[PDB]
């Protein structure tokens, strides 16, 4: 059957093939067979966040703003710098109730700074009583208040107007956190500020703020019907912070150093483990060798771009033509 | 007319044939015959069919967007909305331009290359029984009746049976 | 399921060729010639990793971004932030599909063209000492042992010293 002379040769040249080829799409067809195809998306996650390149700060039922204001159970986050703050869904406030205008603005800017380094300052408080306390904010089984704030009360049933000021001379910016306490009735305003009305006015060399207290009733949270509205001010180097008020003032103890860097915040419930990876995702950590991923749109660090496709096969060989009846 | 099987794959094409995309035209003692090949035109059509189904009917569902036109005037917020809308139109317009200009190049390259194999396939089946010249035709020996056209169309053409008869023409 | 000098690129894909990618297989007086070949496997490889390294490891830096999901319904700001990421995901997803589809076509086209260059390189190597029956296989006359066949792969194969035997198993 193999008819062949001792001079006639063949020199048949060909390529390789595999019995099992990979299914992968092209621009003309969609079901062409190539030898091996490599995945181009990262559809799997480890399930934990590892703080190998970055310094990860855990939540532990403490949101970022609550640690900023100085809650009693959040007192473990004093002057602790971080590279990426992780917020847990189990977070809940356990102190005096409060709200802030532009909640996302204050949360984003202090997360970008990534530094809660706070320095106490000696404000010249004359004609007030400091260290005000409340029964809904307990520390060490005793009544307390926000750790970084200072409630003010009359001394001999008198509240003289406060004309305190202090300048800024350091080369960096200064961030001040101050608030206004809203009473629940006209009796409380007289009994806690010795004045029927009230006004708060802070000002810098480039901007000013003015808040009028809003008296009235509010729903009870933690056996307290009052509210505190907290505002933030940015003090440039060489600027002067002048505060004039006649009541309903929550005094700040000092200033918070801010900067510009790579720190941010992210809400996730993933635990903390030990690995060596850069990508941070609410589902956990993912490898970054793939050029694309479809785990979650929220990410941090050196991460692949997010796509909505589940799988993207990329050919790494040549077309497969196997079998031929044997 | 002049006849001669003038062109094909060089100079001009054919307009009379409608039944397919690529065909054959032979001249011999029996006259002139024309018939199309259904194998080569299938690949060109399927590649073209692969273009249409990948774009026609493929649309994503968008339900709620921002306002795109405003009868009033505002500051940063309105200006930002006009800016984010303008840069999306520019990117999509450029993506459309790069898409159609690349599909056409592949379509023209593939169609020329796909039926290039059709001309190359016949030459490899006429390794010694035919010659080639510059208008895409052949010089097929031996005497090529209706059977040889069908045999080379259906691929069952044997070069060895008419091998020695082909060489006298090559001899002179 | 038998050794009968099976065809090459246009018909089949071999399974015993694992060390190389584009190898030869000769059937001479000895009988077997399945072996690997160089400078053609690596050339096909070269464009493959070049696509890979540019695609694997090329990662950009993004640290602080806007919130992507919200728990409270807001006005135009939340609507704008939701859209400004919907258009970003949609444009990146189309860019990924267009990239991998275009990257795929050039992979198959280059590999098919790379072997076609190899096949014609041997075809121009032997000027008139061999022809092809039309299946990527040659028909080499004259006394060709494994040393004669191996000399074809490595470059030196003189046509004129083998001219006398070539023309006797040919046209004459």
């Amino acid at each position: 059957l193999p008819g062949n002379d001792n001079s006639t040769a063949t020199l048949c040249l060909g390529h390789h093939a595999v019995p099992n080829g990979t299914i992968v799409k092209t621009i003309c067809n969609d079901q062409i067979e190539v030898t091996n195809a490599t995945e181009l998306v990262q559809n799997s996650s480890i399930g934990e966040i590892c703080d190998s390149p970055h310094q990860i700060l855990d939540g532990e039922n403490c949101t970022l703003i609550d640690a900023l204001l100085g809650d009693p159970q959040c007192d473990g986050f004093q002057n602790k710098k971080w590279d990426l703050f992780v917020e847990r869904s189990k977070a809940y406030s356990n102190c005096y109730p409060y709200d802030v205008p532009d909640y996302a603005s204050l949360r984003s800017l202090v997360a970008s700074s990534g530094t809660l380094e706070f320095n106490n300052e000696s404000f010249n408080w004359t004609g007030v009583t400091q260290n005000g306390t409340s029964s809904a904010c307990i520390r060490r089984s005793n009544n307390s208040f926000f750790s970084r704030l200072n409630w003010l009360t009359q001394l001999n049933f008198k509240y003289p107007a406060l004309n305190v000021t202090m300048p800024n001379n350091e080369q960096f910016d200064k961030l001040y956190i101050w608030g206004v306490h809203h009473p629940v009735t006209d009796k409380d305003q007289i009994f806690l500020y010795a004045q029927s009305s009230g006004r708060i006015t802070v000002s810098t060399k480039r901007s000013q703020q003015a808040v009028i207290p809003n008296i009235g009733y509010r729903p009870r949270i933690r056996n307290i019907p009052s509210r505190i509205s907290i505002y933030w001010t940015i003090v440039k180097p060489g600027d002067i912070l002048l505060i004039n008020s006649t009541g309903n003032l929550i005094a700040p103890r000092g200033y918070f150093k801010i900067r510009s860097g790579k720190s941010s915040i992210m809400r996730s419930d993933a635990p903390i483990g030990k690995c060596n990876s850069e990508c941070i995702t609410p589902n956990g950590s993912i490898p970054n060798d793939k050029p694309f991923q479809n785990v979650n749109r929220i990410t941090y660090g050196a991460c692949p771009r997010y796509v909505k496709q589940s799988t993207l096969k990329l050919a790494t060989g040549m077309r497969n033509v196997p079998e031929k009846q044997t | 007319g002049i006849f001669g099987a003038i062109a094909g794959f060089i100079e001009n094409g054919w307009e009379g044939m409608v039944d397919g995309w690529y065909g054959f035209r032979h001249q011999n003692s029996e006259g002139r015959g024309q018939a199309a090949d259904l194998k080569s035109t299938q690949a060109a059509i399927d590649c073209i069919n692969g273009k249409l189904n990948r774009l026609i009917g493929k649309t994503n569902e968008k339900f709620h967007q921002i306002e795109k036109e405003f009868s009033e005037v505002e500051g940063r917020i309105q200006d930002l909305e006009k800016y984010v809308e303008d840069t999306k139109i520019d990117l999509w317009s450029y993506n459309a331009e790069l898409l159609v200009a690349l599909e056409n190049q592949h379509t023209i390259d593939l169609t020329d290359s796909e039926m290039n194999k059709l001309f190359e396939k016949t030459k490899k089946q006429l390794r010694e029984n035919a010659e080639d010249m510059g208008n895409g035709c052949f010089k097929i020996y031996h005497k090529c009746d209706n059977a040889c056209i069908g045999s080379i169309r259906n691929g069952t053409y044997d070069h060895d049976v008419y091998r020695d008869e082909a060489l006298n023409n090559r001899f002179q | 399921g038998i050794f009968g000098a099976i065809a090459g690129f246009i018909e089949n894909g071999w399974e015993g060729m694992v060390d190389g990618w584009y190898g030869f297989r000769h059937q001479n007086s000895e009988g077997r010639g399945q072996a690997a070949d160089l400078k053609s496997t690596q050339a096909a490889i070269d464009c493959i990793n070049g696509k890979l390294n540019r695609l694997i490891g090329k990662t950009n830096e993004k640290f602080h971004q806007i919130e992507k999901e919200f728990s409270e319904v807001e006005g135009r700001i939340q609507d704008l932030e939701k859209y400004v990421e919907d258009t970003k995901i949609d444009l990146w997803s189309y860019n990924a599909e267009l990239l991998v589809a275009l990257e795929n076509q050039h992979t198959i086209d280059l590999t098919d063209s790379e072997m076609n260059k190899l096949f014609e390189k041997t075809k121009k190597q032997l000027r008139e000492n061999a022809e092809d029956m039309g299946n990527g296989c040659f028909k080499i006359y004259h006394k060709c042992d494994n040393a004669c066949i191996g000399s074809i792969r490595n470059g030196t194969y003189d046509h004129d010293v083998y001219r006398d035997e070539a023309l006797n198993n040919r046209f004459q």
Epitope: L1, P2, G3 | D158, D160, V161 | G1, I2
Partner: antibody, heavy 122, light 110 residues
Framework: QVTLKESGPGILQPSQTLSLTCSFS??????????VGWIRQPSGKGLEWLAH???????YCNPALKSRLTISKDTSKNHIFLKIANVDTADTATYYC??????????????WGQGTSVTVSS | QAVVTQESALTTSPGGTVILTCRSS?????????ANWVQKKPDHLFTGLIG???NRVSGVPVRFSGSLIGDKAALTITGAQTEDDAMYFC?????????FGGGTKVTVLS
């Protein structure tokens, strides 16, 4: 010496299954280029080639009897088995198992068996 | 279906030359058809003569030879003897199966 022997039932009823076993000595199916074929003669008409089995488990048979012919081999005990399904009066024939040599240039029909008469009747 | 047709019968004296043919209705007969010639004596078993249209089975005398005569295969018996009175059959390969011919009865006047 190369010898081939055929064995069969001889008398079969219509629409039964024909089983034939070929016994041979002097060669084995493990050698390259070796095969055994089946050829039947209806005792008066011409010759009819049925099928053969090559040494690499390659099967070739008559297309007119593909659905009814099954043929296998046993290398250990050097036997060739042939099965015919749905026998008829046209299958009444003398069946020969024979050696076919696969060499360069073609196949050689060198050695043949004695044969075994098969009769199909009711 | 590829029927194979040869001569019905032939006659010769002891010593004459007999040329048998094997014709195929599918077309040209080539070396790829692998013509096989087998003879059948009335009392002896089947013995093959020519395989692959040119290769001779060892053991047969020199008077038997096979070749290609034009469009058909052929078997040549130069100087036939009294032992050549036997049936003669031809087989052709059609790339899937072997087809045997009708047979040629070579009769030698003994």
């Amino acid at each position: 010496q190369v010898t081939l022997k055929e064995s069969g039932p001889g008398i079969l009823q219509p629409s039964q299954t024909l089983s034939l076993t070929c016994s041979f000595s002097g060669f084995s199916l493990s050698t390259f280029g070796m095969g055994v074929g089946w050829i039947r003669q209806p005792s008066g008409k011409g010759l009819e080639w049925l099928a053969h089995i090559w040494w690499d488990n390659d099967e070739y048979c008559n297309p007119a009897l593909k659905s009814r012919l099954t043929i296998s081999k046993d290398t250990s005990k050097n036997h060739i088995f042939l099965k015919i399904a749905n026998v008829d009066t046209a299958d009444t024939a003398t069946y020969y198992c024979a050696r076919i040599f696969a060499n360069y240039g073609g196949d050689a029909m060198d050695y043949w068996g004695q044969g075994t008469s098969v009769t199909v009747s009711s | 279906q590829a029927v194979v047709t040869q001569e019905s019968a032939l006659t010769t004296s002891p010593g004459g030359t007999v040329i048998l043919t094997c014709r195929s209705s599918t077309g040209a007969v080539t070396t790829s058809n692998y013509a096989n010639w087998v003879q059948k004596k009335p009392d002896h078993l089947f013995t093959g003569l020519i395989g692959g249209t040119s290769n001779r089975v060892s053991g047969v005398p020199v008077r038997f030879s096979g070749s290609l005569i034009g469009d058909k295969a052929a078997l040549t018996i130069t100087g036939a003897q009294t032992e050549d009175d036997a049936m003669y059959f031809c087989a052709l390969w059609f790339s899937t199966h072997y087809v045997f011919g009708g047979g040629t009865k070579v009769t030698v006047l003994s």
